[PDB]
Design a binder for this molecule. Sequence first.
Ligand SMILES: OC[C@H]1O[C@H](O[C@H]2[C@H](O)[C@@H](O)[C@@H](O)O[C@@H]2CO)[C@H](O)[C@@H](O)[C@@H]1O
Length: 392
Amino acid sequence: GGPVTLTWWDTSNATNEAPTYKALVKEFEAAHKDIKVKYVNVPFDQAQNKFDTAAGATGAPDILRSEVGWTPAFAKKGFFLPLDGTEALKDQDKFQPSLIKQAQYDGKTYGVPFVTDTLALVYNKQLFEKAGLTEAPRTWDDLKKAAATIKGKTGVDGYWGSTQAYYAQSFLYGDGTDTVDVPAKKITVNSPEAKKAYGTWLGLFDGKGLHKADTTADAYAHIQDAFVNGVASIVQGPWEITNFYKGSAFKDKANLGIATVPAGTSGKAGAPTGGHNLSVYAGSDKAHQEASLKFIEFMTSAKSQETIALKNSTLPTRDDAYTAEVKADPGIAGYQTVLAAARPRPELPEYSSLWGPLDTELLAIAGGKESLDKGLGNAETAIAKLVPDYSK
Ligand SMILES: OC[C@H]1O[C@H](O[C@H]2[C@H](O)[C@@H](O)[C@@H](O)O[C@@H]2CO)[C@H](O)[C@@H](O)[C@@H]1O
């Protein structure tokens, strides 16, 4: 009869975010001797499928850094334990209520808001200043023109957009639409507004200053390597702030300009809301569940979140965690303003599963393998399988 051996499957950045969390794991083990936590970093791309496999069978973890979109999905699948009336939610009033709504499923909370974020048009102030530009482009049409001016002046590419569906979601919000209509229940991916929205996204690869699409699976890493070293601007979240400062372009932290994503035909801009929630596995024995409820209370404390914000530059979920040290950081202050345009996700557990087919079909459209209506038509049929309550 020794201590309780827990296992936390972390999905954060292994270089920037993991060291900060590995330090908090030791702080909990130092204060609580009867509990031991086994740190395991699982790549984000594989974390959803790996947990879905393990949760039903054996080798499942006790705690999981679940994404805000996977929490209602795994809560629907019965893998997560409900945290209503537990020591993990002792400070339920301190968190943002909108983030507690994302963790909820069928009127019951299955996760504790750990971190939060949204995409934002990050840019290089030196290259924009050298190109005779003061402010960031307000619309997608201004971004196309701004890139050609930056290319003509400096000779560096003005913009390199991501081929992924999560990043392409900002265009649907820009043109006044979404992937699906939940109240009416209908697939709006092959609709008038989506065809135009994706048409604008597809148009941002071709042009002077605009970098062409990359069909590789690791395209994401090329977009960081380019922007960190010095491409003029990209659409990215706050989790790469620490990664940006490591590069040669952003030695000066003030050089990193953070503006809201440009708007479309709707007038106002829009970006997808994200983040992660800590959630306990229901199949674990009652001993490990009680020990895990204590870990989440500590990990989502005012002290821990305030520390995490200073190290990782990620936005805390608690309102009390925003001190002057946190507000003084350029990154956090810059992303708190763009958070105004972050569109919350609707009450649909399969909403995140809809990006799966889109990531495949959009990479075909961007790569020049299929036409625009070809891929969107296939995505509309592939989406209908995962959610047949629409129809098209
Ligand atoms: O790709 C969409 C995805 O982006 C963000 O996920 C990050 C996350 O901050 C960390 O786990 C990081 O280490 O890697 C992920 C890479 O995507 C958002 O946090 C997430 O909501 C969104 O689905």
